[PDB]
């Protein structure tokens, strides 16, 4: 009885609800319509999107195009699926982003029957490489990077996935600005610290430095590096072999697992009869407690 209430009946009655995904805050519809909408005078040509997402544990990478029923996705990459060859520890980092981008590139190219042509960059390096179509061959695949809500700042892992793609053989337009090799004040691209971050010298030097400063903070930091005995060295060749295996076979297969039952883990919505019984027996219990006195 002090202040007028805000969330009253009328406010709800005229409140408007945003889109489901906007309310969950998972899709910026402004930029989404900005990215995915194909021109009108093409009518069937899908504007492919390289969708990259940062997960506290994983890295999501997929190539999608939207239709009326929803988005159509041709192929996807998963950092949790990455260790099935090559690297086994150090996921959801920049090196992981580049590797999984290259993996997605290669598996798209294979499932397009196109992997042989447009090798991309077999040799990994931090400089600029943008693929070109070759005459007499099917046109080079192009797509754009669907950054999403992530703050696209120079040196963001999503750009690492983009570099993995462009080295893989995808023509994604991009300036040479948002990479570790770029210098802001000097407007220059070093292109060597960039490949250092791409391959992992950026965490390699840090974790090798961390030896002589500490050991137990070392333990609490790279605990899964201690297991697998992941040395600061011997961390170049295994990334190389990861890339080699990416080149060899990027195809992905599931695991046949059908032995499950219908053990419902939730509870269903009770029917009207249950609500009526509940309210009536609550009525009986209340009236009984009162007549008890």
């Amino acid at each position: 009885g002090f202040v007028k209430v805000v969330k009253n009946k009328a406010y709800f009655k005229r409140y408007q609800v945003k889109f489901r995904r906007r309310r969950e805050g998972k899709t910026d519809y402004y930029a989404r319509k900005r990215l995915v909408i194909q021109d009108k005078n093409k009518y069937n040509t899908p504007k492919y999107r390289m969708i990259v997402r940062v997960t506290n544990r994983d890295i999501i990478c997929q190539i999608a195009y939207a239709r009326i029923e929803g988005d159509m996705i041709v192929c996807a990459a998963y950092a949790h699926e990455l260790p099935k060859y090559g690297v086994k520890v150090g996921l959801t980092n920049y090196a992981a982003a580049y590797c999984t981008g290259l993996l997605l590139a290669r598996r798209l190219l294979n499932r397009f029957g196109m992997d042989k042509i447009y090798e991309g960059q077999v040799e990994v390096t931090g400089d600029e490489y943008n693929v070109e179509s070759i005459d007499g061959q099917p046109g080079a695949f192009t797509c754009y990077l669907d950054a999403g809500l992530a703050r696209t700042t120079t040196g963001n892992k999503v750009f690492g996935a983009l570099k993995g793609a462009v080295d893989g053989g995808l023509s994604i337009p991009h300036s040479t600005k948002r990479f570790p090799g770029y210098d802001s004040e000097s407007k220059e691209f070093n292109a060597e610290v960039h490949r250092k971050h791409i391959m992992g010298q950026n965490v390699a030097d840090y974790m090798r430095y961390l030896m002589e400063e500490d050991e137990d903070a070392y333990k609490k930091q790279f605990s899964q590096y201690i297991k697998n005995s992941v040395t600061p060295d011997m961390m170049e060749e295994m990334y190389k072999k990861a890339h080699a295996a990416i080149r060899e076979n990027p195809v992905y297969e599931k695991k046949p697992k059908k032995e499950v039952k219908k053990k419902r883990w939730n509870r269903p919505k009770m029917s009207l009869a249950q609500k009526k019984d509940r309210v009536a027996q609550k009525k009986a219990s209340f009236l009984r407690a009162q007549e008890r006195a």
């Binding site: 408007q16 906007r22 519809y29 009108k40 005078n41 939207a66 009326i68």
Partner: protein, 159 residues
């Protein structure tokens, strides 16, 4: 008397439907518009670009051109003395597909497959659509129930 602005008398015309303000649903964007397909003109107000003039709202036309963000359509506009064919350009979100021609085409396709099936089976079949003919004299059962007797209820001045 009144002015001749491009959007006079469109206060309630271009208002968003209640509980529908805000970002346009994206589905209406990637609808695929051919040439010669039939569309109607709505003119959503939240986009102020490519606006059709107030007259064309709520009329149906056929597309004669297609561009990056709009389509060229032909609509018959009634001038005072006669009706003229106008070619106008409107950004996509102001127009929708028209179900009239779609329903006609569905009926036509059913007619074509009916034509196919009636041929070899040898029986003569009906094609046109008739306008609700007379109603086929029939019986109504009683089951021994007495038709209840109505009687107007008496006038009372409630208020």
């Amino acid at each position: 008397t009144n002015t001749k602005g491009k959007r006079r008398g469109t206060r309630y015309m271009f208002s968003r439907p209640f509980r529908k303000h805000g970002v346009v649903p994206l589905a209406t964007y990637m609808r695929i518009y051919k040439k010669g397909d039939i569309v109607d003109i709505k003119g959503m107000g939240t986009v102020q670009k490519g606006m059709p003039h107030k007259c064309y709202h709520g009329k149906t036309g056929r597309v004669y051109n297609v561009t990056q963000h709009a389509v060229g359509i032909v609509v018959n506009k009634q001038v005072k003395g006669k009706i003229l064919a106008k070619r106008i350009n409107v950004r996509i979100e102001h127009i929708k597909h028209s179900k009239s021609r779609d329903s006609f085409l569905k009926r036509v396709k059913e007619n074509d497959q009916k034509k196919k099936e009636a041929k070899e089976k040898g029986t003569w079949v009906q094609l046109k659509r008739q306008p609700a003919p007379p109603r086929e004299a029939h019986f109504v059962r009683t089951n021994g129930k007495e038709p209840e007797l109505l009687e107007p209820i008496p006038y009372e001045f409630m208020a």
